[PDB]
Amino acid sequence: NNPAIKRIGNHITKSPEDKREYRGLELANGIKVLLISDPTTDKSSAALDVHIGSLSDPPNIAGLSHFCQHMLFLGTKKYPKENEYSQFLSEHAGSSNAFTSGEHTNYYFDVSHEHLEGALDRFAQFFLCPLFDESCKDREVNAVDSEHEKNVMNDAWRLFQLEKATGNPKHPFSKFGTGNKYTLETRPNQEGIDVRQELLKFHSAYYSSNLMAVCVLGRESLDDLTNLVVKLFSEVENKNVPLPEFPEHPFQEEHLKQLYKIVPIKDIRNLYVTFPIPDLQKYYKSNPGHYLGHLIGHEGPGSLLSELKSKGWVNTLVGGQKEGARGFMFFIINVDLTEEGLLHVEDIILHMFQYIQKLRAEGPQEWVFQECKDLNAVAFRFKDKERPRGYTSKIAGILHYYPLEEVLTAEYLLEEFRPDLIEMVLDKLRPENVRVAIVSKSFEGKTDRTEEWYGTQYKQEAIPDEVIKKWQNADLNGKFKLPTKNEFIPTNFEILPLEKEATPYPALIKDTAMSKLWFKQDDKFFLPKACLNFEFFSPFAYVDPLHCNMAYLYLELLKDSLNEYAYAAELAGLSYDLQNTIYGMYLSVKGYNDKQPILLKKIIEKMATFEIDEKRFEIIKEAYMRSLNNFRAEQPHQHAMYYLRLLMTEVAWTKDELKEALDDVTLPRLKAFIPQLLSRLHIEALLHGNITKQAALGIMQMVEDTLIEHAHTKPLLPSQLVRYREVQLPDRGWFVYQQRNEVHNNCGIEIYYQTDMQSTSENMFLELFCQIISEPCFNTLRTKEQLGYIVFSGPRRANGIQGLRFIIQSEKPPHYLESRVEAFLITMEKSIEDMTEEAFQKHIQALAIRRLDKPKKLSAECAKYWGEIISQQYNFDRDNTEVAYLKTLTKEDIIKFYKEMLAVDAPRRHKVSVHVLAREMDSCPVVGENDINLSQAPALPQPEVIQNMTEFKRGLPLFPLVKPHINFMA
């Protein structure tokens, strides 16, 4: 029947725990579609993936596909308005984004479930009648240039492009996909090229329905979703475009047995080993590449990493297959490098081949395959319910690789044991097919080449035949042994029955001087999982820079010590996070509840009886020093946020103070520190998931008893549970702190308009206002003015206080950026006064939906509760309470709020600005003074420049702390 539908796939295989309904189908024009019905979803979404990417960019216009990606949001014939799409989503609690890879351009969005069609309609036009407006083209080009500019000094991006430039230059893999102003404007201009026309041609030539896949999720029934998609996408024209293929590998003979010495931006030491391999995508039912990745990349006893670490040459290792494109892939083994390791690269590589030889000697093991198969099946069956936006975008992409019926299970459920494929891939991991890259500052001044797109400095050399020979003659090393059965594999998945006293929110079930225990048995996800969060309070974790360094080192040494044992648990879906905080320590264990008690007990026991390995201590200390210094290489806006944090927080040690006190941390000092840190503590925990009250109480008490027995831990005094306050800015005051980024040639800025302490009314005044200015800020400061790629506005919450913040990274100086933000504020005032009552009520409804969006998985609901606990506000019913108050606000309330707290002449304006200057910028005024289609910046007063952070805080009062919400139990 239905001529618009070529076929409706059979039952879509899903997890028996997945209540969502699915329907696969292929439209007449060839678009693969997957419909998902979820009658309970608060937000609906859709995504469309075009199987064409930067690899198909015309040789003379690098980055065109990426540019087309940006341009499609800027207007269509049906919806001409430059921001009709984004504005519509914003006003309906939605969001959107997109990315471009070598063979894909993925577009996606989410929106209130009641406005799926309105959003899908505007979205579908992207692939039917884009405008590619000339004015939008000249402006948006700056956004692309700005995006590339931020990656320029990024080591990951530089290495990513260096690999492409080190392969066959004739191969499309060598293309620069990001593109910039030069390649998208300048170059084409001085070549008589009309980018507008090129975009029209590219889109017309590659945006064919036969190469498109779509996924839509909404509350509507599968039949309604079907008619919806047919009605909006069946008109996409099918030009039967051939799927681009790349059978010849970018790395040919002359590209093998090559060594590269690279100079990084940050002070890092890394060794990258790469092997060219065939495209293994078609073997998804067996995944021979992952099999080898699992073995070679194993941490755990007898692994390559274990020996490499014991020898003090490496700290971390990553192994396995890496995607390339249809026709080719790579197999890598990347490792971290210690100072000693840097001097033994040849030996490290020999060990890599010795381990590989071991795998050849033992041959493929079915029990290993069986183990991964079982774990993958368990993972799929109990997979957490995903957020719509990410789910649709992911499905749209994978619809291009798997049959409709298998789209959900394809990446999880293994079916075939293939020793023939495993051996085939292992046969490619040989010395004569290797590429080795070393990244180190020690190569500074020893390089003779430069990568054009990023300016990366490196040197290329052929690996001497004897070195290759020695690796080829790699023999068995007794230190290398295959892993043993994973004893952490879960077997008990029974869901405990909901207890009679089960509560809607966490309940305080223990309130002692030693610990405060919040508990909630899962009442909606019903998966065999649990989240155990613990907050250990101790004044000695942040008393001074030295102790902060020791707190960090201690936990870092601890995790490094448990790694081998904890890796098996990680594979079995049982992980943990352990880190030092400004108040002590934070520990979180999550995953299948079955064996959590075992891992937890092990962690605490290890914590209270830790014996530091001197060698591990020195190496980890050296890496930490490096990590502190490397912050200088972070982006300008990250620096701005960093400085503001230091400025507004009562107590905060800087990275300079920390590394300065780091040379004072000795093994003896660290050994004395640990017992001191654990001597007195207070624990506030949240146990949430598939667990009973008695199990929770049991877990909590087990942690205390372990500390008491081995560390003789005593309760902390209530008066010692200190919380830091935020600096209280004076009415009508304006302070400016200026610094310079010596790595990035871009400026960064953060403007903070402090309002008042957090509370129901104050919270919603700020949030409603941010909701109203959110899309306009982006549209004005970026799409129109093109100040930069990174343009952000939103609420800032810290230490119980809150306000409005703006974050921008640009080529333009901070004082100019600030003038534009002030001009934008004026625009928003007029805009609010000029908006209709209904438009206002629309923003209220949008914020409401955003705040009431229900978490889809346990960790997300747990995080929300944890947020209430960590902030010590414990307002578990916050969303309902705050939204009810929100729906009470009028335009007048928001106008008054603005005039009293935000306006340039506001009686209670509390403003602080952080100016981060670009590398090649000696100074910059802190304030500055046509009309161009640019609005008028209000005139600003003279700011008080901050010369010393300490003095700044001393001369200002401190806000009080927010009073807790009262939660009564025992």
Binding site: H70, W157, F160, G177, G319
Partner: peptide, 13 residues
Amino acid sequence: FVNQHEALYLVCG
């Protein structure tokens, strides 16, 4: 560990 864990974006998250 195993490598399962590079593209361009319209907008920063």
